[PDB]
Design a binder for this molecule. Structure first.
Ligand SMILES: [Ca+2]
Ligand SMILES: [Ca+2]
Ligand SMILES: [Cl-]
Lengths: 358, 5, 358
């Protein structure tokens, strides 16, 4: 196995694939004028393909991922990196820098089982980025309800939808992708969502997604990501949307966020409770803690509806406001023991639902 | 905190 | 106690000055001035703020982080009105109101009074240079308690800092334009850090006052005081190699990047790398217990006899990262002697690294 490639063509691919001892290695394969790099944890797999425009020789091996990445990253801008297999070592040469890395056999590298694609669609990279970033923060953190630790990906009509929830708060985001899709839902584990997000470079290259009965695959440029799915019965976001909200509040997002952030300082450190008092064109936020300390914020808002008092975990509210990168926010309420819906005043593409504290 | 429902 | 002050006039003082009362800041309004003090019993920072607006005298203590977080969380330009009320400190700005728990000013610890025995003034940038050049070589939590800090030595017209962890050493010397008595003291590492961050890169002179067991540094509106480490520091002069007659000179960054790549395949615990020096050439090698190997060859300036030497590459990299200059000189003797490293253009900072037999 031999190849010689410029550093700039190796870096990004190594980065992408690098994020049983053999699981700490990358599989390198030279075949048909292409270098393939694969990384896996048994649950998911990233593969990059690199065209070889210089002389090269076929073969495969496996080398330490971090060490190989760190060597290439440490080399200077515009370096050429020559690689060849010698005995049980992989030699790397650039300029007058030389390295000999340990290897494990390519035949020992684990392969995910083959599976069949049941649903396929394409979408812009920016649509996937929007879908994930809109909801990722609402996924559970190591909940014993495993399905809550991942992200629901749902197809309905011509829309792709993400849903994330931890049993207390929920995020949902739907985007049109211009293709007739089957009605279908799968749960992607948290590590899969992180990787799916990482492979979005920020360019013209559109995403091709393939879903099987137990797997999902995403193709972007010269990268292929594959993950297992999660089994379990994911919550239905439709249940938890305020059915016919009679109370509507509109306020500046940043103003609201800064007031919640200040009030949070004097909230219970563990329970994070704040109280909202809504009245005509006014919101008051209060917080107090076991040390008897007290915060009060009063803000001008646009509010029609009856006066009411409602409690929330201020962290959940702040998370939503930080996720809403916008000028004005709309909140839709029912009563003090029911969920609140929070949205961008200018877009209905994402919705956030937070259940109150008694 | 109430459970979301 | 009452004062109204602009947010921005409180933030840097609060930043600098940051038993439960050790988590509080002492606030005093007297003679047109707000004073703020924080302490950990070993050291103390006092910050003074001019009070242009109406105010009333008195004193209290308030939780540092909460008060800081509230002030920081208020909008830019905000006027912050403070007054005492019962066992509470009231903070008001705009339509934001906060009631913080206080602890009595009379319970706030004082450092014992002491007499100044040696004093000098120097530019802030000079003290910043002295500390920055050596700080990284102080010990952390070593049983040899006198190494957990920095020697400050006065001799002739120069102030010198020395730091060592018993393995590697840094020394920096600067003229300060005053004739000084011969004296030296050990400043605790936490004190070095706080002194360092008190220096704002400005035109205010720094006045230093040294007592038998204490040190005080004052710059503009800030006064720092600390206990000294009551112990015997090792003599740096004994560590420096004698008349090293083999000077290698090289680009700092090129040398650093060559060591950084080679370090990847060095022993993770002991980090030994070998140097082979020859006419205008350096070769660096590294290997680890898995028998992986790195080699770097680069052009340098060198006309001495050929020789080999080993060094801890982490220590060498710490020095090169601290130097941040264009060219470095490595002053060599032989395989069984230490090396002294300096900026090729200045003898003001020097670093000693012991030899390794690999
Ligand atoms: Ca070699
Ligand atoms: Ca209800
Ligand atoms: Cl939606």
């Amino acid at each position: 196995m031999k190849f010689t490639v410029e550093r700039e063509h190796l870096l990004k691919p190594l980065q992408q694939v690098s994020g049983l001892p053999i699981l700490g290695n990358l599989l390198l394969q030279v075949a048909d004028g292409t270098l393939s790099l694969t990384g896996t944890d048994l649950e998911m797999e990233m593969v990059a393909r690199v065209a070889l425009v210089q002389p090269h020789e076929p073969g495969a091996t496996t080398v330490p991922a971090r060490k190989f990445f760190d060597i290439c990253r440490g080399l200077p801008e515009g370096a050429e990196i020559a690689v060849q297999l010698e005995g049980e070592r992989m030699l790397v040469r650039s300029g007058r820098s030389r390295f000999s890395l340990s290897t494990l056999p390519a035949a020992d590298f684990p392969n995910l089982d083959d599976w069949q694609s049941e649903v396929e669609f394409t979408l812009p990279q920016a649509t996937m980025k929007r879908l994930i970033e809109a909801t990722q923060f609402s996924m559970a953190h190591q909940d014993v309800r495993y399905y809550l630790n991942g992200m629901l990906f749902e197809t309905e009509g011509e829309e792709l939808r993400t849903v994330a929830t931890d049993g207390h708060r929920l995020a949902v985001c739907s985007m049109p992708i211009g293709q007739s899709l089957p009605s279908h839902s799968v749960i992607v584990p948290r590590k899969g969502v992180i990787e799916l997000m990482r492979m979005l470079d920020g360019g013209d290259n559109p995403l091709r997604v393939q879903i099987g009965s137990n797997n999902i695959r995403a193709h972007v440029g010269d990268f292929i990501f594959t993950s297992k799915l999660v089994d379990g019965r994911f919550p239905d976001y439709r249940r938890v949307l305020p059915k016919n909200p009679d109370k509507h509040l509109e306020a500046g997002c940043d103003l609201l966020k800064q007031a919640f952030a200040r009030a949070a300082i004097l909230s219970n450190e563990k329970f994070r409770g704040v109280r909202l008092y809504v009245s005509e064109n006014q919101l008051k936020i209060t917080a107090n803690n076991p040390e008897q300390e007290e915060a009060e914020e009063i803000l001008d808002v646009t509010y029609s509806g009856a006066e009411m008092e409602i409690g929330f975990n201020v962290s959940y509210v702040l998370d939503v406001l930080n996720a809403l990168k916008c000028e004005n926010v709309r909140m839709m309420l029912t009563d003090s023991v029911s969920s609140v819906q929070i949205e961008d005043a200018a877009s209905q593409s994402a919705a956030y639902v937070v259940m109150p504290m008694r | 905190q109430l459970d979301l429902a």
